[PDB]
Amino acid sequence: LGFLGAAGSTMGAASMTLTVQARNLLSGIKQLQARVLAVEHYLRDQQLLGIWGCSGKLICCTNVPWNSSWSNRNLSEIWDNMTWLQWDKEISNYTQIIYGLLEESQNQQEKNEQDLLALD
Amino acid sequence: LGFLGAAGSTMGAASMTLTVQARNLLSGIKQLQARVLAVEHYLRDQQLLGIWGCSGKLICCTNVPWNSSWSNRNLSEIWDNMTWLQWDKEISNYTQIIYGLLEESQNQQEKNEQDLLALD
Amino acid sequence: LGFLGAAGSTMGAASMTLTVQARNLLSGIKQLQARVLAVEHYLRDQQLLGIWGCSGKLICCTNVPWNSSWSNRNLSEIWDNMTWLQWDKEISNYTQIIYGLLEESQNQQEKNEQDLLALD
Amino acid sequence: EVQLVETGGGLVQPGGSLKLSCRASGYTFSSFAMSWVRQAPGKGLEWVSLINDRGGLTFYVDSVKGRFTISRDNSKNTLSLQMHSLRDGDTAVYYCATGGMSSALQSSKYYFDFWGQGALVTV
Amino acid sequence: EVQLVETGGGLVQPGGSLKLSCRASGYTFSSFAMSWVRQAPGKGLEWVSLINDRGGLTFYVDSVKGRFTISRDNSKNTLSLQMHSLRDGDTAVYYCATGGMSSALQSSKYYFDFWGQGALVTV
Amino acid sequence: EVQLVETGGGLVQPGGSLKLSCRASGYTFSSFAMSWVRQAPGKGLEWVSLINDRGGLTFYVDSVKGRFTISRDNSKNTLSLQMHSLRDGDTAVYYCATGGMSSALQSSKYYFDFWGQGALVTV
Amino acid sequence: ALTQPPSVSGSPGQSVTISCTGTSSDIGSYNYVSWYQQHPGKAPKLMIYDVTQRPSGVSDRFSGSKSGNTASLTISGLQADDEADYYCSAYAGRQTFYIFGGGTRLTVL
Amino acid sequence: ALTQPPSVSGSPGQSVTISCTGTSSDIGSYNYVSWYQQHPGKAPKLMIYDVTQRPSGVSDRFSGSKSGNTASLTISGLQADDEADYYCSAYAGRQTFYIFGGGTRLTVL
Amino acid sequence: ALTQPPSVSGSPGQSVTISCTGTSSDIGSYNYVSWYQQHPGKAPKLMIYDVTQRPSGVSDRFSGSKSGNTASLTISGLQADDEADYYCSAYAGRQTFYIFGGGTRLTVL
Ligand SMILES: *[C@@H]1O[C@H](CO)[C@@H](O)[C@H](O)[C@H]1NC(C)=O
Ligand SMILES: *[C@@H]1O[C@H](CO)[C@@H](O)[C@H](O)[C@H]1NC(C)=O
Ligand SMILES: *[C@@H]1O[C@H](CO)[C@@H](O)[C@H](O)[C@H]1NC(C)=O
Ligand SMILES: *[C@@H]1O[C@H](CO)[C@@H](O)[C@H](O)[C@H]1NC(C)=O
Ligand SMILES: *[C@@H]1O[C@H](CO)[C@@H](O)[C@H](O)[C@H]1NC(C)=O
Ligand SMILES: *[C@@H]1O[C@H](CO)[C@@H](O)[C@H](O)[C@H]1NC(C)=O
Ligand SMILES: *[C@@H]1O[C@H](CO)[C@@H](O)[C@H](O)[C@H]1NC(C)=O
Ligand SMILES: *[C@@H]1O[C@H](CO)[C@@H](O)[C@H](O)[C@H]1NC(C)=O
Ligand SMILES: *[C@@H]1O[C@H](CO)[C@@H](O)[C@H](O)[C@H]1NC(C)=O
Ligand SMILES: *[C@@H]1O[C@H](CO)[C@@H](O)[C@H](O)[C@H]1NC(C)=O
Ligand SMILES: *[C@@H]1O[C@H](CO)[C@@H](O)[C@H](O)[C@H]1NC(C)=O
Ligand SMILES: *[C@@H]1O[C@H](CO)[C@@H](O)[C@H](O)[C@H]1NC(C)=O
């Protein structure tokens, strides 16, 4: 479909086009500043993915349970009957909570891994 | 040997010096633009490696079979009797095909991993 | 505690605040040059972590033994009775040796992994 | 409205092979996982194999893990199961069934939903 | 100065359950790994379970792996062990012990250091 | 032109140890994987151990996995095999062989190519 | 395999139950215990899925539950036409996926 | 272990075959079935590598093939000097690397 | 389990030893062989940790060592008050963590 072609498709359809858009995030003092800022934004998103334990991944699973209050919808009405723009709006008030939990979860897992590697 | 010291060596000899050259990819408006462009090129290559499922790796193996038409040579005449410059010239017409297959292969594997993590 | 809040704490206490400071590494020609340089430094540190086999990790274990001459202290007097600034000063003369060993160790392991994937 | 119709051969000698298939209609084939279940003439039901909705992941019981191959074609709405060796203990009615697995973004199944007519294979 | 005092119930019928606990004092509870060891009335000592200093990692002997749960609360300086099923072979004096593991940044243990008074559990 | 010559001791008592070695010439030692194969006086051939061309990866049969150590020195063109415990079942002629493995960038082997003279070890 | 009675019976208008037992690693560990009704000469059809859920189109006379390491199917209002072999099945794990019990022959007096 | 006949025989000028059998997880799963000729008092030497390939320097009288879960070595033009114990071997996996059969004694009449 | 003698004895002022044996995968593979003294009616207390180390507060009459796949505890200067069952234990691995032997009854004459 091309860049943003899946924007109007359902979440479970648009989830198969992640590489199409990922490849378009990287591809006159004000223009140079714009390029530097675009690089900084890319690196900040990559840093967030790294902190959560998701390095070379576009889809990664975590150990943070869904708390229902964030969204109490069925899977059959999110992935099959909703777009990513609608979902993003629906949970825009919770994105700074979930991310914090994700960071804490990785911090515990990373330390646990170290302890499992110290058993002779 | 140092940076590019293995350029005249065989592919199977030059494959042991990947860190020497990897470390030299990062190490006046026009000069600042040149530095920003060098950063953008580095990040684009890292993005391609990430998409293919190769994150913190210099040598990574994939699930795309060699199709022979790309090059029907024996391993004994590629790694032992050829340089990387000659190889790069030999398959310069196929690099945009192989990369596409690599992206598709990771997309299938990544989804398969998700499904294997949904079995109780 | 916040950014650098653990600077005066012991190494085994400060090791639990790595995400707090990692998130603060990314967050007018001279100012643009300063921003480009900050990006280059970030990428050089990420490249060193990648070469050593540590990609999306803040704590990673290696196969390089401690050689004692670098520091012959007990674990009980490093992690419990020392800060990271004191440790950094104590081994500042050896950081270019350890890193070299780390690169060599990964080079051997990466090749070994390839060989283990060529056994039918 | 869901119709699952098994086809394939009947009696073979020990050491032979058979390819069974299942034609599906009445639902979107690519939206459901599919499996094969068998019933010996004098026994209850036994699960034999499971394939996911995309055909990439297959699972088998240990007793057939190295002998049976399960595949599907989502454009032809067709399943197939190719059995090798064909032991005396493999005599059974084989059934085509829809269910047994989901794909993370769908709700859980862990049950068989639609069953076919069944086909008897003997050795 | 280290005091480890076990509490919990005594005799139960087969198929029941018991929650045992251990109160610790005289040392920093969160700085040490903790474990449970049992001794049948006529036998020697047997290790039962191990929990690390942060409570995140638990280990069991295979004979109890699916039946016993070990947990700790570092703010209450309290351990607990919840046993299900309660088989005849589980009759023993259970002891609370400090040691058995370390956390990579501490020196190695691989031994049990402090032992509690012990409590007898029968079935 | 390839010469593989085994050296080492002969008869030892149960519970002892022996270090066997192999001198190689006529080919580039570092370019090939090496292995040890043994033949009991009244039996056929049995593979014992395999080491790759760089010495980093070693493989053993389960019957010796915790008792034998295989190593090589590519500058001295020398192999060695150090056997501990030395059981009665280890009496055999041991042979030094070139082959059995490759290194991903070379064509496949999965066969033994050059064989040495052999040396008899008894217990 | 799972254990079920070989035969269950009762008179029309009465309720009956069919038990299914296993171990703590399979029927007790996951709440996915389904039931199927196989009429003689016919392919099995789904009667119960999940521990307590019923498929759409199936009469509300069929219900079920689990406790401990066992589960059961209850048929209320037994009819003369309920002539079938009933089977239980459950999800076991990622190595062994499904385990079936033996059929229980329902005889209606 | 792999199974081979204990003895094979024939007259000079005739062809003979030596069989090698195993299971579907080893000889049938990988096409790496080699053969060795061990003359009495000598170390074994390679005669066949791969299923059908011959080493350089070995006479073209030695050939072989596989089918199903078995394989064989064929010696055409048998000579009086072919006095040796022949062994088959095959790659089994990444846990067990090589499996050898018993020796077959070749008697030339 | 580890093997220990069921009983050890000697006269006051004499030294005694208590052996502990296992296999090459547990007592021989890791140097973590501890010893405990369990007085009748009391909980065990630590006497030796590591192969050769003593806890603080424990008298220097208790020592020990290992060789091969065995280890021993030596009690020098045996006293009339050393009435206890002595146990050995060792770290085995990341699957099985600790293995204990049987108690050795120390009788002081
Ligand atoms: C737009 O919505 C229709 C249904 O109304 C759907 O069939 C179509 O595929 C959608 N287009 C995209 C690009 O998702
Ligand atoms: C879900 O969110 C609410 C509101 O923030 C919170 O009170 C509750 O504890 C959360 N659930 C869990 C399991 O923490
Ligand atoms: C969500 O699932 C419940 C079952 O727990 C069902 O009753 C409900 O109707 C479902 N809602 C939607 C929108 O699918
Ligand atoms: C977020 O919170 C505000 C109130 O502060 C509310 O008006 C808004 O609707 C909330 N967003 C969503 C998506 O519910
Ligand atoms: C250059 O080629 C020669 C062989 O002609 C080889 O011996 C030498 O090592 C090569 N140099 C490098 C740097 O590869
Ligand atoms: C190899 O390349 C040719 C030409 O692009 C193509 O027709 C062929 O299908 C390729 N092989 C495979 C296995 O796809
Ligand atoms: C490539 O391998 C084949 C064997 O399949 C051989 O016949 C051919 O000579 C080899 N070519 C080279 C250049 O090594
Ligand atoms: C690539 O294709 C062109 C024709 O478009 C051909 O002339 C050229 O030789 C090809 N490159 C290689 C390396 O064969
Ligand atoms: C500073 O040192 C004191 C001990 O002298 C300690 O209690 C305190 O926690 C330390 N502060 C930080 C931030 O580590
Ligand atoms: C430790 O460092 C010293 C001095 O650099 C060196 O001589 C010694 O070999 C090192 N230890 C090891 C094990 O390499
Ligand atoms: C370090 O450990 C040794 C034991 O090997 C001990 O004797 C020494 O006192 C310890 N030093 C410190 C500072 O803890
Ligand atoms: C590093 O070496 C210099 C001598 O070249 C010495 O004066 C200095 O103290 C050393 N640093 C440390 C931390 O010992």
Short mmCIF file of N, CA and C in Angstrom, two decimals, chain A residues 62-70 97-98 101-102 105:
data_model
loop_
_atom_site.label_atom_id
_atom_site.label_comp_id
_atom_site.label_asym_id
_atom_site.label_seq_id
_atom_site.Cartn_x
_atom_site.Cartn_y
_atom_site.Cartn_z
N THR A 62 5.80 -8.01 26.31
CA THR A 62 6.29 -7.62 27.62
C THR A 62 5.58 -8.41 28.71
N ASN A 63 5.95 -8.12 29.96
CA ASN A 63 5.38 -8.75 31.15
C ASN A 63 4.50 -7.80 31.96
N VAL A 64 4.03 -6.70 31.37
CA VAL A 64 3.15 -5.77 32.06
C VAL A 64 1.71 -6.16 31.71
N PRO A 65 0.87 -6.53 32.69
CA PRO A 65 -0.50 -6.90 32.35
C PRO A 65 -1.31 -5.66 31.98
N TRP A 66 -2.35 -5.87 31.18
CA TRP A 66 -3.24 -4.77 30.86
C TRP A 66 -4.14 -4.56 32.07
N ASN A 67 -4.29 -3.31 32.51
CA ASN A 67 -5.00 -3.00 33.75
C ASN A 67 -6.50 -2.74 33.54
N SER A 68 -7.03 -2.97 32.35
CA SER A 68 -8.45 -2.82 32.03
C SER A 68 -8.93 -1.37 32.07
N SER A 69 -8.60 -0.61 33.12
CA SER A 69 -9.04 0.78 33.18
C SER A 69 -8.48 1.58 32.01
N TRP A 70 -7.33 1.17 31.48
CA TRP A 70 -6.75 1.84 30.32
C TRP A 70 -7.68 1.72 29.13
N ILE A 97 2.01 6.26 31.79
CA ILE A 97 1.94 5.32 32.90
C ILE A 97 2.48 3.97 32.47
N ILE A 98 2.04 3.54 31.28
CA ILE A 98 2.42 2.24 30.74
C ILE A 98 3.91 2.20 30.52
N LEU A 101 5.79 1.65 33.68
CA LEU A 101 5.72 0.27 34.14
C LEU A 101 6.65 -0.59 33.31
N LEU A 102 6.74 -0.30 32.02
CA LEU A 102 7.61 -1.09 31.16
C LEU A 102 9.06 -0.94 31.58
N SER A 105 9.61 -2.96 34.69
CA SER A 105 9.62 -4.39 34.44
C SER A 105 10.96 -4.84 33.90
#
